């Protein structure tokens, strides 16, 4: 079939129609983002030569060749540890939580540590980490997963606990029902819609969270970015391992039936063939790794500045944060990954209003200082952008710019003065 | 160590930063040389409750370096000379 | 098959014609000792970085 | 060891080219690595197949030389891009972006620049010598809920003040710098306290 695009939505414009919404979602979503890879190194000379020593000497003839993999390789070793660091080591100070979870009915146990688990991982994290599965060896990386988990613990309690301003300077504690409220005021909402809504902005956020936890659990695709990183890794080593058994041209793949089967005169030539063959594999891998790990560079670099942008503060930016008015994230620790729950504002249940651009009233234009005109029917009103809460039109919520002879578009109405 | 076998350093119980990493946690630094799991800050816990604030009374003007390579040194290593002179 | 590595008391239950065995990487890691017949594991010699 | 960033750069350049240098003296199993001797030693049969190893190992050198440089290039245009998104966003403005242009509230970055490279002077405003408060999150006076314009509703103990919300400047809660929206009776932690009315 011809794919569809979408549903076609034909938008009702006019020229002093208005659409503002009545009601919000909190809405909870996650982001994938790899880190680091698995950190490999190859002892060269075993990889393409073994225990024979005059393999090794024949090899000594292509110079340093080896010595710059290995290079290359430790580079990239050392990289997959900055990158954790970048990403994850974005506070000097360890916060908690504290014993009373009391946060104005915002509840926080999916993401919040679990002191029953040895791992003292989050549930949500701990259902990450369960989703997720010849002279090479693997370097374990700097920061364990329990140090990545306590950087996640520390972020998530100091956003909880003082918001943003851990990542500005010293912590300063707010309640959260006033942090949500500032991050309301940051979307352009007035906070008494918060206050006001306080219970149901908190059951939306939990049930947001659980339902997360539970599309995670179900999903066995939605990890798909961590575990191509680790398949990729795994089926490069494999093949680098499985390019011994290939003779290359030669009479055999291994070097000791070579040796045992022919003089020095050609047997020569045959290692030559096994070791350019071998060289050239290792090659192939060390440049295939250079470009994953410039890839993988890439994804950090963008997940600390996820981190620093969503997570330390609320960002403005459209779509970076989530899908949504952005309000706060929370960083979760994966297997070679983190996942960030963004917590966004998104407008629901909108209504149909009459708008004008201002007001004439006493010869006089009004403006509103910060929301719209809108009538419903047959009263005019001025409400704040992003919410439907009609107030009555006074000279504290407009202002007064010239005569109504210049406005296209300006209505006739009263301006009450209080 | 979980990174391997460690010869010359004394595995200490205290926690310092990183000076020279060995993996898996375990950092070295010369204070003789000691081995020690890798310290993630100091421990902090914010005096939260459902009705204090903690407000600035004063402020701080810092300056931070940010330091970022541009270019590389333009080279151009002639194939022909190279291989055969 | 020639090699170096370490041989150890192995339960893998070969088959009565099998006189080696490999891994998912075709590398050989159990053979049957011809003289008597016992599954031995080669695990590599201890290696590493210095 | 505060500028490690750009000498990293030009350390791993000047050791690539090294290692290029370094495997002219390489034969690749041809009789010398120097290719005057073999042309003043041999008849071109032969000359031929020495000559075929050296250009072959050369050749790999050079290609391999080529794919580092076009790598590490792409590393280099990455922080450059950087840098010039750091230079937009900084220095010709104030950005909102957390930790984007320093630690802390940015106010202003200057350039300087340093060998093939840039240093930025991020400018920024740390908050400082914080004090504990009592909050609320409204006021109620006279059957009204009064919610702060811009700051916060603080307490010291005995009297309650609206502040900006970085900067302590304790203010009378009025009904210039509040705002009223609907009762008492669902603002869960509203307290009582008066609004002065100028
Ligand atoms: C605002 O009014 C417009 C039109 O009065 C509504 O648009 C109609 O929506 C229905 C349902 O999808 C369509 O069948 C009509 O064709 C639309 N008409 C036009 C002119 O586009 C719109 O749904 C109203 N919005 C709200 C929030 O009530
Ligand atoms: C805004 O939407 C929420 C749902 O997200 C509405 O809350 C529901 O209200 C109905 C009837 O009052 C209850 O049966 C549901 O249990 C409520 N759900 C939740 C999650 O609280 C809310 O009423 C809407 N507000 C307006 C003004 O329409
Ligand atoms: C916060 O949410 C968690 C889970 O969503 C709640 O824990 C549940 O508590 C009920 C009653 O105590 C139990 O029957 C469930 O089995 C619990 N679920 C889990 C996953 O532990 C918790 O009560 C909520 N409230 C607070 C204050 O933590
Ligand atoms: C538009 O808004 C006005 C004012 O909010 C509405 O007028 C009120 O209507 C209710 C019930 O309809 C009455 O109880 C009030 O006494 C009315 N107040 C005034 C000042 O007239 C009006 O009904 C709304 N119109 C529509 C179509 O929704
Ligand atoms: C809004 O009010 C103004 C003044 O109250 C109206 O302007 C007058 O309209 C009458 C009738 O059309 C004219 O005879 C006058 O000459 C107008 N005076 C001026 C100064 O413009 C205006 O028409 C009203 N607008 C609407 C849409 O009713
Ligand atoms: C605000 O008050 C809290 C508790 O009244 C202070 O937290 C205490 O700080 C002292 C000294 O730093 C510690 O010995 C206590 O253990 C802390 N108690 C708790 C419960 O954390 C906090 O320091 C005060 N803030 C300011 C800026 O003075
Ligand atoms: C805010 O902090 C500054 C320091 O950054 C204080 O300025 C100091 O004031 C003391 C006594 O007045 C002087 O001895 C110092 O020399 C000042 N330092 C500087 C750098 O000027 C300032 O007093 C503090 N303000 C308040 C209200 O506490
Ligand atoms: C809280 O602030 C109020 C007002 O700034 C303080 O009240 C003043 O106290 C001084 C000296 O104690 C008197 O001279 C003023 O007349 C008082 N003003 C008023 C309006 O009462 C109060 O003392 C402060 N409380 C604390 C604990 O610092
Ligand atoms: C804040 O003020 C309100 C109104 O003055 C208080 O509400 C009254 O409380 C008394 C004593 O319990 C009752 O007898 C009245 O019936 C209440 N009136 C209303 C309208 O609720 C309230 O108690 C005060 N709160 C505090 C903490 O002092
Ligand atoms: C919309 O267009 C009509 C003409 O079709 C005009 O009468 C009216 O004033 C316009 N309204 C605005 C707000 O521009
Ligand atoms: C082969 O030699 C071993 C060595 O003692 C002996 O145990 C075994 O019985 C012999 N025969 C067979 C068929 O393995
Ligand atoms: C804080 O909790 C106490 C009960 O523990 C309650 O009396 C008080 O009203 C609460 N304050 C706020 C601002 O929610």
Not at chain 1, 299 to 317: D, F, P, T, Y
Not at chain 2, 38 to 59: C, D, K, Q, R
Not at chain 3, 12 to 22: D, E, I, V
Request: glycine share 6%.
């Amino acid at each position: 079939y011809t794919m569809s695009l979408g549903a076609e939505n034909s938008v009702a414009y006019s020229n002093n129609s208005i659409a503002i919404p009545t009601n919000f979602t909190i809405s909870v979503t996650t982001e994938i983002l790899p880190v680091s890879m698995t950190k490999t190194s190859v002892d060269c000379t075993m990889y393409i030569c073994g225990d024979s020593t005059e393999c090794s000497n024949l090899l000594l003839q292509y110079g340093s060749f080896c010595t710059q993999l290995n290079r290359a390789l430790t580079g990239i070793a050392v990289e997959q540890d900055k990158n954790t660091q970048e990403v994850f080591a974005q506070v000097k100070q360890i916060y908690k939580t504290p014993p009373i979870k009391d946060f104005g009915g915002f509840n926080f146990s999916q993401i919040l540590p679990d002191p029953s688990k040895p791992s003292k991982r989050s549930p949500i994290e701990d259902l990450l980490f369960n989703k997720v599965t010849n002279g090479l060896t693997v370097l374990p990386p700097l920061l364990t997963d329990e140090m990545i988990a306590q950087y996640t613990s520390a972020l998530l309690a100091g956003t909880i606990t003082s918001g943003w301003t851990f990542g500005a300077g010293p912590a300063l504690q707010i309640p959260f029902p006033m942090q949500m409220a500032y991050r309301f005021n940051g979307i352009g909402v007035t906070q008494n819609v918060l206050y006001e809504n306080q219970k149901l902005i908190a059951n939306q956020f939990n049930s947001a969270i659980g339902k997360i936890q539970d599309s995670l659990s179900s999903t066995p695709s939605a990890l798909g970015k961590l575990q191509d990183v680790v398949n990729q890794n795994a089926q490069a080593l494999n093949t680098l391992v499985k390019q011994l058994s290939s003779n290359f041209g030669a009479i055999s793949s291994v070097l000791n039936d070579i040796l045992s089967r022919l003089d020095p005169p050609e047997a020569e030539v045959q290692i030559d063939r096994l070791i350019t063959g071998r060289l050239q594999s290792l090659q192939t891998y060390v440049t295939q790794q250079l470009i994953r790990a410039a890839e993988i560079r890439a994804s950090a670099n963008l997940a600390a500045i996820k981190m620093s942008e969503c997570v330390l503060g609320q960002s403005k930016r459209v779509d970076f944060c989530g899908k949504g008015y952005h309000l706060m994230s929370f960083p979760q620790s994966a297997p070679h990954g983190v996942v960030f729950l963004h917590v966004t504002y998104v407008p629901a249940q909108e209504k149909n209003f009459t708008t004008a651009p201002a007001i004439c009233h006493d010869g006089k234009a009004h403006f509103p200082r910060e929301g719209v005109f809108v009538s419903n029917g047959t009263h005019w009103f001025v409400t704040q952008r992003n919410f439907y809460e009609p107030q009555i039109i006074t000279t504290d919520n407009t202002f007064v710019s010239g005569n109504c002879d210049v406005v296209i578009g300006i209505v006739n109405n009263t301006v009450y003065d209080p | 160590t979980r990174a391997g076998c460690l010869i010359g350093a004394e595995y200490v119980n205290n926690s310092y930063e990183c000076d020279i990493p060995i993996g898996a946690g375990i950092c070295a630094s010369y204070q003789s040389i000691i081995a020690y799991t890798m310290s993630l800050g100091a421990e902090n816990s914010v005096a939260y409750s459902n009705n204090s604030i903690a407000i600035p009374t004063n402020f701080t003007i810092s300056v931070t370096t940010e330091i970022l390579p541009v270019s590389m040194t333009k080279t151009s290593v002639d194939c022909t000379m190279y291989i055969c002179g | 098959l020639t090699g170096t590595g370490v041989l150890t008391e192995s339960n893998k239950k070969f088959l009565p014609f099998q006189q080696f065995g490999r891994d998912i990487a075709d590398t050989t890691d159990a053979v049957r000792d011809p003289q008597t017949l016992e599954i031995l594991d080669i695990t590599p010699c201890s290696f590493g970085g210095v």
